[PDB]
């Protein structure tokens, strides 16, 4: 097991199609012991190979913020501590994404979008890291924001912010011995996914979307499938474990090298 | 017989004759530019400021975080430039952070309502100021925004830095609205200006000169104010979505 | 009033009145520039070529490959200025590769050779010609390369693509070589300048739209670098390409 | 062990301090089978490779020799038996001449030695991919070494150059790899110590380069152990960075990412 005795946090699991099923399921099949947090979600983690902890965790709520380190000390035991965290939570109301022009997106939606995909990033970091055990890692999510796009609009600012946050968790968590990384995936057909596909944002935005896909798959050497989640779990396992343990407030790219091809 | 000889710019960011903002002002005037100053909060002390500029401009008031502002902007500009006159340079020079996004602070002790306050006025502040005025720009129009290169973390600008990775994010979308008026969208990232932390930033000052193999004078605005009118200007027609980098060349060497 | 008023700019690379080189040297001239022109090989063909300009301007003989036009340029360059005078600008506007590692041909299936000669010419020449000029160049002073964005692979230009990516790498280390003189040093990446998928790409995803067949918002932006508008970049890259690389789709 | 049954290819030892020492270690710690590659000083390769876990065979390549490139295949083929693919590629060349690197100002390097450099440092990197992708197995890796060379600095000046010829020629090698269900990407390093050899001037540029780096690295830079840098050529060698090619991890505590 490439995860063998390793005590992780893994956060966003809402369905069985989020990206965090997956990485939380091949951790376990790596022999990591997990703990889970969530804000339902009971019924959805019970699919796992293992069964794990789920604790409240709304990143927006200061207090379950400010308690949550002595929970998960309660759930994995006294005198245990983290090896690893997974940030897999990405948020943006539908005025900031999708449809609606860049210009119509209020404040007040960027704003939380912002809160919950970017900095929730640095607040997950500052209540875990006092229970992190050196040489441990912290993972977060990302889709990358280099360059503008249709649709992701307010999304792709979210991201830019993350990989920036990224960076500066990256220096505080090295005082722990700790390292911190994103990994930028390829198009994922999740449960939101599939219905743009399937029509529900307009022909319009569906064409804009199958473009963007198809031209993925054509411009990564590999390959891209944008249905597999599995080599975008495998990618975050990598950075879990102790086999890349240079690498800290970095980005690694598991998009099927896309982003390294123009046509 | 000037750079920008006929050109309405609207100027944002004047807060004293150290802003970046009042050097652009002043080189926009002295390259023939006519110009529209937009203020915030301190107006009167903006007004005593504006008038050391050589030309006479008017002064609107301008609050980012007001929507009413924003909605009026284009109405009031017009009444400033003559009816049936259109802009064509936006100046955005509009920056801030509270102490605990930025500084001594540390980076985990930043509350969020003081981070989204600061990427409110650092970086959505920027496609704001696009919508209301794209509008009133002619084609060949320039919109231009203040960064300080974020691609790398660095010891207490903590907070801030975000905020201009969000920046570059968003001047990127801002050039795909831009576009369809005919208008450029970019960013001058500039070097370190003078307008346990504070060892570590005086480290950062000092290794810019070091790296810039032009040198670095954090005392003198003008060749990031020159840079900007450069923009503002109809030299760099097919440049935009993109950052252009005032900042001695520090960016692009190690050591 | 030009933007380029009483400044000496050498400009080489002009082989046809389509090259970049031949806009930026018109566009350099109506803005009161004076200049000194390179020409490679078919020298009666660029004389021609260049009585097209709006003004005369003497024409040198540079083969970059050929070390012993190197070491006389500079000499060659005070004769047809004046002695007593510098240059103030210098335009590298020179590229070449051999068929076999550019176009149709297997990536695979390029000889070292023919991308050693496509490496020499499009890359190393830079640092080449930035040491021949630099010791008569005027503080304030600007040398301007061409530049095609290698950061990502494409299909059909591949060993061109490579000499690129070792081009704006040869620029950084000129930057600090010219420095030490008061002397910038910047590359131009255009747009493409009259495959067809690539370039039709091009325009849908510059914001403001790519026109392959004009070539003057390209010459202007390397006036731009020429002027004194832009004094504090160097060992950097400035895009004339519409904007098409800051977008994905 | 990570690599378990893999038939990996090591090019590049030369000493016991070459990181391609270190990465035919770790990967036979790793349970892979390996075949490695000396030039030269074949005699004295030898006697290095007696250092590692277990016995490997040697062949010989000089990558600007193309009757080597041209047999290579073959050569392999026969070192791991007929039938039997390769599933790791490891390319550990790199080498640039005094007057391309060092002391020398970077305006005295003739281009011959800039030649010289780029044709070992970057060209070699699609020789070797050319040669071996015929005889790799779906899933495989190609991977090479790199410096992060997006900034210029002192001393380095031509191999910078070469590197950024490097990751230039890894995205290509990528869309030939691809083709085979191969990946190739590179590992960027920090400094690894493999004096006052090179004078007052260069001594303290280097050694400021090199102080600079455990500074900035969030979890710190030991110049003198690769170990990190083999572990993480391994990473991409395994099935454990399925989706990632033509690109570059950064093995250099992460000092790039940081300012000051
Ligand atoms: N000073 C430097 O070292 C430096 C370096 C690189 C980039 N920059 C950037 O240049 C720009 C100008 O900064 P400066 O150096 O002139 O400092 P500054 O303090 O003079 O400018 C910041 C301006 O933001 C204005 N502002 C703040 N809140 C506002 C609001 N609610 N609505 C409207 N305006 C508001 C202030 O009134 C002020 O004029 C900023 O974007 C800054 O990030 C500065
Ligand atoms: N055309 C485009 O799409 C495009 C796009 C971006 C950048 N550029 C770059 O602009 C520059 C000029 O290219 P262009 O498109 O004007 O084409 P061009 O064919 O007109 O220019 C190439 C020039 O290089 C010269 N040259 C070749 N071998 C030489 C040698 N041994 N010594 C000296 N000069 C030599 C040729 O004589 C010619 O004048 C090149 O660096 C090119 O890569 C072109
Ligand atoms: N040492 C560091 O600080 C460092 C840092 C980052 C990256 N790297 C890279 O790691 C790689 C390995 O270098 P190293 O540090 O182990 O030094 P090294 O000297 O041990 O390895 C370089 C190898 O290249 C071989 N070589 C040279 N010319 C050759 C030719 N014509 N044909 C075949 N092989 C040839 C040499 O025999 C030698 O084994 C290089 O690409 C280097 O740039 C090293
Ligand atoms: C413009 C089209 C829409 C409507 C979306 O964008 C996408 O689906 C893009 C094209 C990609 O498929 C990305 C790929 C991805 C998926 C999960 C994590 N990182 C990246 N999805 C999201 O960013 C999606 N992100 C997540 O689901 C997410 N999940 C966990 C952790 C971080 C996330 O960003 C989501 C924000 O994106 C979208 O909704």
Not at 60 to 86: C, F, M, P, Y
Not at 89 to 110: H, K, L, R
Not at 138 to 150: E, H
Not at 164 to 181: L, T
Request: hydrophobic share 45%.
């Amino acid at each position: 097991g490439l995860l063998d005795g390793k005590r992780i946090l893994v956060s966003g699991i809402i369905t069985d199609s989020s990206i965090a099923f997956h990485i939380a399921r091949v951790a376990q099949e790596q022999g990591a012991q997990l703990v889970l947090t969530g804000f339902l979600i009971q019924r959805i983690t019970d699919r796992l190979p293992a069964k794990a902890p789920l604790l409240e965790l709304d990143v927006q709520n200061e207090e379950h913020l400010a308690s949550l380190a002595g929970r998960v000390t309660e759930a994995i035991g006294a005198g245990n501590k983290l090896d690893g965290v997974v940030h897999s939570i990405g948020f943006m109301p539908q005025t900031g994404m999708g449809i609606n022009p860049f210009f119509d997106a209020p404040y007040a939606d960027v704003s939380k979008g912002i809160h919950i995909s970017a900095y929730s990033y640095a607040s997950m970091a500052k209540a875990l890291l006092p229970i992190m055990n050196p040489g441990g890692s912290i993972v977060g999510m990302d889709f990358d924001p280099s360059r503008a796009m249709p649709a992701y609009n307010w999304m792709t600012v979210a991201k830019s912010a993350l990989e920036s946050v990224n960076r500066f968790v990256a220096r505080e968590a090295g005082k722990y011995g700790v390292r911190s990384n994103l990994v930028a995936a390829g198009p994922i057909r999740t449960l939101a996914m599939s219905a743009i596909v399937g029509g529900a944002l307009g022909e319009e935005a569906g064409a804009q979307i199958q473009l963007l896909e198809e031209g993925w798959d054509q411009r990564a050497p590999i390959g891209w499938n944008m249905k597999d989640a599995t080599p975008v779990a495998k990618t975050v396992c990598a950075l879990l474990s102790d086999w890349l343990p240079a690498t800290t407030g970095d980005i690694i790219y598991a998009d099927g090298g896309a982003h390294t091809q123009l046509l």
